[PDB]
Each structure stands twice: as structure tokens, then as C-alpha cells.
From Swiss-Prot, chain B:
Protein name: Spike protein S2'
Consequence recorded when altering residue 8 to A: In strain: Alpha/B.1.1.7
Top-rank taxon, per record: Viruses
Function: Subunit of the fusion protein that is processed upon entry into the host cell. Mediates fusion of the virion and cellular membranes by functioning as a class I viral fusion protein. Contains a viral fusion peptide that is unmasked after S2 cleavage. This cleavage can occur at the cell membrane by host TMPRSS2 or during endocytosis by host CSTL. In either case, this triggers an extensive and irreversible conformational change that leads to fusion of the viral envelope with the cellular cytoplasmic membrane, releasing viral genomic RNA into the host cell cytoplasm.
Length: 49, 49
């Protein structure tokens, strides 16, 4: 059982798919979407070419 | 040894490990010093009695 669940969705270039991670740096990690270092959760990505 | 250089010359998310190692070493050394002081104080108390 959890308390609340948040879902965020968008489209990411394949060259920086691994920028989405706690304590991670990159071109868009520091500029478009920042994750907390103690982030608890799951990330899901599938191709939509 | 300088934790300021660790913080500046190296990224935040991974510097936690180095800071933790420094913390453990310094804390253990402090504990050792305190234990030796306790034993010496006991001996001095016997002499004073």
C-alpha cells in the first residue's frame, strides 16, 4: 500500500534516455527534468518511432 | 583528506561515499582518544585517593 502516486510522461531523445535517474547530470537533466537524489519510484520507457 | 576539495573537485551525488569514509575514520579516532582518556583518568583517581 502507498499513499499517493504521481505519473509524469513526455518524449525524450534516445541520446539522453539515461539522463532520467537520481543524482544524474546531463544536458536536459539539469535543464528540463531534475530527479531528487533520494527518489523512490520507477521509470518506464518504450519506443514510439 | 581535504573535504572541501572533495566537494568542489568532484560531483555532489558520489561525494557522499568519500564524506562517509572520512566521517567514519575521524569518529572512530575520537572514540579511541576518549577511551584512553577514561582509563588514564581512572589511574589518576587512584593516585589521588
Amino acid at each position: 500500500c502507498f499513499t499517493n502516486v504521481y505519473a509524469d510522461s513526455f518524449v525524450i531523445r534516445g541520446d539522453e534516455v539515461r539522463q532520467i535517474a537520481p543524482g544524474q547530470t546531463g544536458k536536459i537533466a539539469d535543464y528540463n527534468y531534475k530527479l531528487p537524489d533520494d527518489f523512490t519510484g520507477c521509470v518506464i520507457a518504450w519506443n514510439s518511432n | 583528506s581535504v573535504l572541501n576539495d572533495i566537494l568542489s573537485r568532484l560531483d555532489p551525488p558520489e561525494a557522499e561515499v568519500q564524506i562517509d569514509r572520512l566521517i567514519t575514520g575521524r569518529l572512530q579516532s575520537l572514540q579511541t582518544y576518549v577511551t584512553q582518556q577514561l582509563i588514564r583518568a581512572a589511574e589518576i583517581r587512584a593516585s589521588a585517593n
